[PDB]
TrEMBL record, chains C, D:
Whole-protein residues included: 215 to 277 of 391
Species in which this protein is naturally found: Mumps orthorubulavirus
Family (UniProt): Belongs to the rubulavirus/avulavirus P protein family.
Source taxon at top rank: Viruses
Name by which UniProt lists this protein: Phosphoprotein
Subunit structure: Homotetramer. Interacts (via multimerization domain) with polymerase L; this interaction forms the polymerase L-P complex. Interacts (via N-terminus) with N0 (via Ncore); this interaction allows P to chaperon N0 to avoid N polymerization before encapsidation. Interacts (via C-terminus) with N-RNA template; this interaction positions the polymerase on the template for both transcription and replication. Interacts with host RPS6KB1 kinase; this interaction may play a role in the viral replication and transcription.
Length: 61, 61, 63, 63
């Protein structure tokens, strides 16, 4: 024992390191997803401005 | 006609304004979702640091 | 020149696309229930690991 | 003092929670297909509306 126990604990820790690295790769992908939600928000602002111009047009024939 | 057509077009435009405002409220909510993905990413960094300390501990008994 | 009827048709098309966009945004939103769970579960892991680190450490303290 | 076995049990618990976290992150990721569609569909609406604005406007130009 003694060294055996520490080796077995170390094996759990390394397996968890690997999980964490996989989680980080996945979460990075979700973050990239978020950056286009940010672009979607921008596009919305632009669409509103365009509608308002068209509305001004329609109001004056 | 003439004024009728412009009124009918204006009705479409206003309906689209309302849709845009609803879309903005929803997209704002997705953006808030994203801000906790950002917190999740942070928590991951911290967990890794904690595992590394525990690993140092286990390496020296 | 463009006709009023053609304008109405194009706007009606746009309005349909916005609605369909809206439906998809709704489905993404419905995932929030999940992102919150992820945050809370990860937070539990974080706190627990840090606690374990502390339990393992030898602390010397006097009265 | 804490025992090696107790440490192994707690770590095994944490490892299970990470896995379950991972499953949930995977489900959120699978939504990307949807966020991209939203971006592309909104972009079409944006471009089309701006185009319509231009079609409606009277433009004077000479050779």
């Amino acid at each position: 024992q003694s060294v055996i126990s520490a080796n077995e604990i170390m094996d759990l820790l390394r397996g968890m390191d690997a999980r964490l690295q996989h989680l980080e790769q996945k979460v990075d992908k979700v973050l990239a997803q978020g950056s286009m939600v940010t672009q979607i928000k921008n596009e919305l602002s632009t669409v509103k401005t365009t509608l308002a111009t068209i509305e001004g047009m329609m109001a004056t024939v």
